[PDB]
Design a protein around this ligand. Structure first.
Ligand SMILES: [K+]
Ligand SMILES: [K+]
Ligand SMILES: [K+]
Ligand SMILES: [K+]
Ligand SMILES: [K+]
Ligand SMILES: [K+]
Ligand SMILES: [Mg+2]
Ligand SMILES: [Mg+2]
Ligand SMILES: [Mg+2]
Ligand SMILES: [Mg+2]
Ligand SMILES: [Mg+2]
Ligand SMILES: [Mg+2]
Ligand SMILES: [Mg+2]
Lengths: 203, 191, 173, 107, 141, 244
RNA sequence: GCCAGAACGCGACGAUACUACCCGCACGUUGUAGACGUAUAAGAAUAGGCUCCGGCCUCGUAUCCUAGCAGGCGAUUCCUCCGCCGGCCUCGAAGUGGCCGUCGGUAAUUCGCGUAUUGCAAUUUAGACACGCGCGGGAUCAAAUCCUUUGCAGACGACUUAG
RNA sequence: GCAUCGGUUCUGGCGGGGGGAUAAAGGCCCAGGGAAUGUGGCUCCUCCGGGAGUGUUAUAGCCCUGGGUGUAAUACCCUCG
């Protein structure tokens, strides 16, 4: 366990329901969470089964007036994830409302949260949970087929930010190569006995 | 009941080369290049000998093992096509109305197009676009014959099926009305 | 550590018309001796005209494996009840003791045939001395010559309380 | 000069009261201690003092900050959560707030 | 004919393979029971590296790169001990990176409060020389 | 139980909220999709409605019954004095939709447009764009050309601002109408060059449309007041002896 | 394509009197679901990868930073690390970072003076944003409603117009 | 707030005693008997890594039956501090 000011989670490769239950418990404890790349989440099973589930959801609506009270069906990948979290929280209480105020969800990686560290929740990773040979789908594909409009805008923006990262990674590799060279030249320079005392201590 | 070890082998002629990287197969030979992506199957490749490829599945179920022979045949056909090529033939069959076929080579896309006229005396005109890499030609050795050739068996076979499936008789007894274009011979360009 | 094999010897109560009655012996697998004796009277009631109220127990002893470090192949004969009718079976196992073989059998019958403990009779447990006495193909692959195999796609063991890893775990251990 | 901090306590969070599924008892609270993840680790902290500090509006005797004192009594569950008793039960709007775990009664 | 294959290459469970257990102990495989269990024992002189004879579940073990050559299947403790020492398993295990990592972890956990103060000061003196060298190479670009 | 006989429903649910329109001037909700291989051009205009009349012509439609014979048809007349271009706007693509980031005006604006920004023009001080105009006389208008360069670099949709010359019609109104008109054409650099060269110049309707072309018309319909079901939806009247 | 437009969803632009606005300084009469080192940017595969090309990978069990009256005053000594300003470039997904210059501070080594009495524990009153108040400097001189009027509108409000 | 006690209760660690096939195994030593998923040798096929025969310890080893160390150790159950 560790207390942080904020945790940023890279959503690619996580199972939708398992990540939702862990995130919900952190919020009720008093931890702030941010989830990015909500379009790359995963759902177990074939895609056709996920489509049939959403269609059953779409058929439910208030009979006497469809502008009030009725289940409002959001289409964006981040709003699909938000719905799963809200089901695991007492959102009709003042305590529950405050907990939801500690969460942000996005598609892609907006400029506040690039140039920042993204963590991973291994208890919900697909490559560690699903038996090889089973089938899975992506939330990004499901959203595109129920009326989400900005799949290609996000795809083009993500390509641009990865191109900037390639330049950043090039500089970062050069710095490490120089630091290693500096440690070699300085090691055999001066330290007559500090080297052995540190080695005995484990450093 | 899981099987501990299942294996298959593939020989390779000295005229070509094979590359595997992250379960992406590339076959290079005297007639062109072919690629195939097999990242949906959990298999292990290795170099058994100087010119033999190995395929293994460890601790596999009965359902999982069935796909081992399937992968072997697919890659083997890839080698055959790149070194010899494939060649399908089709034949026109009609009773009263002759079938007219016109073949043109498009310039912008580099593909072939086939037009069908006078099928059971219909005024509509049928058009089909062949897959890239597949070449069509009217036969000169005999009448009412089409010849399709290429490097990929998947491409040649699916294009030939497109032509056969477009010509159908509707609202009639098809045991009596037998008009259409049908595949009659499958072989290789060389030999 | 769930089951042990016992030896139970029992006898009809002696009477004036028959002093020194006959003695019967059975081998019983049970978690403790209280249910070992109860199981003994259950089987004897089905073979001879004796009850617990007209008999007595002579001796109870624990039988221990003679070499619990040698790998062996076992064969078991049994009789069980399905939802309609009773049937006979013969199964095989590979472990280092008779007690281990019986414990695996009870789990196997529950998984594959939904048979409970209350509907199974054990007939005979025999160690197969020759490698030619193996019949079932799922045992034959294990006694093959020069056996070896790798372990692909192994999930590393990670503490539950450590959420929020900072790196993508591998599966090549 | 002295680029260091001054911390002598361990951080904690107030989770909830002792409760069933539908009944709650405010006289005991559950506290999560940062870094402890089993019963063996939680045995170290039995008997220590816990402080809950917060702000008010007016000054009483030179400050606008108030404290409620308590102590740790026994572990809870299998994952390092512990139980505590305070002089007054905690305000229950602080489910999620932070507390200070001292080291005062030592060894 | 040119063949270029790039794939995985695992370590195999076999008679003679040396395993590492949860509590830093070692053992050698003498018999295979299933795809999940194995019979093993380690007859080592070092009390921290020795294990009794018994069955080990494979889910709680790691495969070291050490394999004893020509270990007979089902060999008893006396035969294993002779082959263990003739090959030099203890010396080979000490040269692996797994052993060195374990030793480093043990040293850092055995530090007292006075040791922690002194390791901070010793690192600063080495750090001073690092910054001077790094500035020189970076300035020359 | 089921209704005795079948009949379709009265009215359509697609035009469902039967409320007054939000704005008096019509609103263009979509523009024709752009093709960068065509020359730059405008896509809309505005005018005023005068009335209807009758014409006579001979039909050309082989196979029809009235082929090569005269027909009588009704037509509509729209009064269209030229428009004046005042500025342009740029738009960018976001994961939340299009949004505008800049708009740059021209140096001189007529009193026709300036009346649009007021509700009591007769007693105002009329200072609407007085400070903006000075940006053209400072540093050779570097601030003006800075915004133009921004549109060339980031935007992908360019529209123009234009207003009518209502003083050329017989109307009593003095306040003009203003709108945005998209530019479809070659390149984003070309769109800015074309749009800026039209600053405070008149544009005639014959340069936008032509003869034998199909177009669309957008406006707000004629207004009636509070109306009952019989005329509003078209339901059957009830018998003569119905009480209440 | 077509209709509505969240009356507690968002963007661009015009003019902004009343110290309503901008800058700097100093205070607290104040509020915040909860500072106390609130330190860590590659992408991708998982039946494969990283690299300084020598090799390396179960393991963040890591790396950085971390001493001095809550951190004083001098010396010996060192050319490291940190900050406020200014100048050039750069950044549009909800606009950010880099280079250079002046100035201020600074245990990598080793010392000299000071610390007491808060009396044997009692939050270590210490952060960041908002809001208010008082000075000292700059910039600015506007609109809306009623009222009269129109009929492209209308039960009354509202709407399209003119003064 | 601390120290020394009384009542109730939760939770760690250490020293002994008894039982069973006087645990069963196991290491070392003595004597007898066997075989194969046959070690070394010998023969044949391929040099292309190896494979196939033959037969009972040799240049590896394994399984049964008695005996000694031995009132061995350890596990499990019970029990005094
Ligand atoms: K009816
Ligand atoms: K000092
Ligand atoms: K006790
Ligand atoms: K004893
Ligand atoms: K013995
Ligand atoms: K031999
Ligand atoms: Mg018919
Ligand atoms: Mg009906
Ligand atoms: Mg009447
Ligand atoms: Mg609105
Ligand atoms: Mg007491
Ligand atoms: Mg003894
Ligand atoms: Mg003993």
């Amino acid at each position: 366990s560790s207390f942080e000011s904020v945790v940023v989670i890279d959503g690619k490769g996580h199972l939708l329901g398992r990540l939702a239950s862990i995130v919900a418990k952190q919020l009720l404890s008093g931890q702030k969470i941010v989830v990015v790349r909500c379009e790359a989440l995963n759902i177990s099973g074939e895609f056709f089964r996920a489509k049939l589930k959403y269609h059953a959801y779409l058929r439910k609506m208030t009979r006497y007036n469809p502008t009030r009270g009725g289940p409002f069906h959001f289409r964006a990948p981040s709003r699909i994830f938000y719905k799963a979290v809200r089901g695991m929280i007492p959102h009709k209480t003042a305590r529950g409302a405050a907990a939801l105020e500690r969460l942000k969800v996005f598609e892609g990686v907006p400029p506040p949260y690039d140039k920042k560290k993204k963590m991973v929740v291994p208890q919900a990773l697909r490559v560690l949970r699903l038996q090889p040979g089973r089938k899975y789908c992506t939330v990004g594909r499901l959203s595109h087929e129920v009326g989400w409009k900005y799949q290609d805008v996000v795809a083009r923006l993500e390509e641009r930010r990865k191109a900037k990262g390639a330049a950043y990674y090039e500089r970062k590799k050069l710095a490490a190569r120089q630091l290693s060279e500096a440690k070699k030249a300085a090691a055999a320079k001066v330290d007559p006995k500090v080297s052995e005392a540190l080695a005995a201590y484990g450093y | 009941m899981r099987y501990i070890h299942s294996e298959e082998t593939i020989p390779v002629p000295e005229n070509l080369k094979v590359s595997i990287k992250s379960r992406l197969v590339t076959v290079e030979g005297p007639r062109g290049k072919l690629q195939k992506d097999l990242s949906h199957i959990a298999v292990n490749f290795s170099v058994v000998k100087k010119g033999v490829i190995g395929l293994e599945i460890h601790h596999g179920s009965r359902k999982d093992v069935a796909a081992l022979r399937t992968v072997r045949t697919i890659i083997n056909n890839m080698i055959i096509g790149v070194t010899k090529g494939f060649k399908y033939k089709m034949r026109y069959v009609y009773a009263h109305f002759p079938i007219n076929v016109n073949v043109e080579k498009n310039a912008e896309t580099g593909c072939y197009e086939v037009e069908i006229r006078n099928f059971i005396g219909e005024k509509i005109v049928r058009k089909v676009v062949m897959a890239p890499g597949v070449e069509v030609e009217i036969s000169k050795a005999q009448k009412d014959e089409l010849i399709l050739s290429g490097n990929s068996l998947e491409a040649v076979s699916q294009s030939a099926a497109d032509i056969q499936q477009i010509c159908k008789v509707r609202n009639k007894d098809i045991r009596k009305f037998l008009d259409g274009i049908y595949v009659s011979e499958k072989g290789n360009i060389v030999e | 550590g769930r089951l042990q094999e016992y030896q139970v010897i029992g006898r009809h109560l002696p009477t004036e018309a028959n002093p020194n009655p006959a003695l019967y012996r059975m081998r019983i697998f049970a978690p403790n001796e209280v249910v070992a004796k109860s199981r003994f009277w259950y089987f004897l009631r089905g073979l001879k005209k004796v009850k617990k109220a007209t008999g007595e127990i002579v001796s109870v002893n624990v039988i221990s494996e003679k070499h619990p470090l040698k790998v062996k192949n076992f064969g078991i004969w049994l009789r069980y009840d399905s939802r309609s009718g009773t049937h006979n079976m013969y199964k095989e196992y590979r472990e280092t003791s008779r007690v281990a073989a019986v414990e695996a059998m009870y789990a196997d019958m529950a998984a594959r045939h939904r048979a409970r403990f209350r509907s199974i009779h054990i007939l005979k447990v025999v160690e197969l001395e020759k490698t030619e006495d193996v019949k079932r193909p799922y045992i034959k692959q294990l006694v093959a010559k020069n056996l070896s195999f790798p372990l692909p796609h192994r999930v590393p063991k990670i503490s539950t309380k450590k959420i929020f890893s900072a790196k993508r775990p591998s599966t090549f251990s | 000069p002295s680029e260091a901090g001054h911390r002598l306590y361990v951080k904690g969070r107030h989770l909830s009261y002792q409760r069933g599924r539908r009944n709650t008892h405010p006289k005991t609270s559950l506290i999560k201690i940062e870094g402890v993840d089993d019963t063996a680790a939680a045995n170290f902290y039995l008997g220590k003092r816990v402080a809950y500090v917060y702000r008010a509006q007016k000054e009483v005797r030179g400050t606008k900050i108030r404290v409620i004192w308590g102590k740790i009594t026994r572990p809870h569950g299998n994952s390092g959560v512990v139980r505590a008793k305070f002089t007054h039960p905690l305000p229950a709007r602080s489910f999620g707030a932070s507390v200070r775990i001292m080291l005062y009664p030592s060894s | 004919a040119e063949i270029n294959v790039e794939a995985t290459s695992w370590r195999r469970v076999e008679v003679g393979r040396v395993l590492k257990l949860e509590n830093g102990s070692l053992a050698a495989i003498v018999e295979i029971i299933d795809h999940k269990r194995v019979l093993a024992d380690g007859p080592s002189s070092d009390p921290k590296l020795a294990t009794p004879r018994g069955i080990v579940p494979l889910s709680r073990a790691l495969l070291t790169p050490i394999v004893i050559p020509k270990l007979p299947r089902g060999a008893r403790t006396g035969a294993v001990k002779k082959a263990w020492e003739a090959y030099g398993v203890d010396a080979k295990w000490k040269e692996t990176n797994w052993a060195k990592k374990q030793l480093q972890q043990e040293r850092r956990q055995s530090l007292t409060d006075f040791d922690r103060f002194k390791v901070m000061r010793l690192k600063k003196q080495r750090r001073f020389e690092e910054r001077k060298a790094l500035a020189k190479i970076k300035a020359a670009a | 139980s089921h209704r005795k006989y079948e009949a379709p429903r009265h009215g359509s649910l697609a035009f469902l909220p039967r409320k007054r329109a939000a704005r008096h001037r019509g609103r263009v909700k979509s523009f024709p999709k752009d093709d960068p291989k065509k020359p730059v051009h405008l896509t809309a205009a505005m005018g005023y409605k005068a009335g209807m009349t009758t014409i006579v012509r001979d039909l050309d439609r082989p196979g029809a019954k009235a082929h090569k014979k005269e027909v009588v048809e009704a037509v509509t007349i729209i009064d269209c004095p030229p428009m004046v271009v005042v500025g342009l706007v740029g738009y960018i693509e976001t994961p939340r939709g299009l949004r505008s980031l800049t708009t740059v005006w021209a140096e001189h604006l007529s009193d026709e447009v300036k009346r649009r920004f007021y509700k009591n023009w007769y007693k105002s001080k009329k200072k609407a764009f007085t400070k903006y105009a000075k940006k053209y006389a400072e540093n050779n208008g570097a601030s003006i050309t800075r915004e133009l360069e921004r549109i060339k670099k980031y935007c992908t949709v360019v529209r123009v601002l234009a207003h009518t010359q209502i003083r050329k019609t017989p109307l009593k109104q003095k306040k003009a109408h203003l709108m945005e008109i998209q530019i479809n054409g070659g390149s984003v650099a070309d769109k800015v060059e074309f749009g800026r060269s039209l600053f405070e110049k008149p544009v005639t309707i014959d340069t936008i449309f032509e003869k034998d072309e199909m177009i669309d018309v957008i406006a707000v319909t004629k207004g009636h007041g509070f109306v009952g079901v019989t005329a509003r939806w078209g339901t059957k009247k009830l018998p003569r002896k119905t009480h209440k």
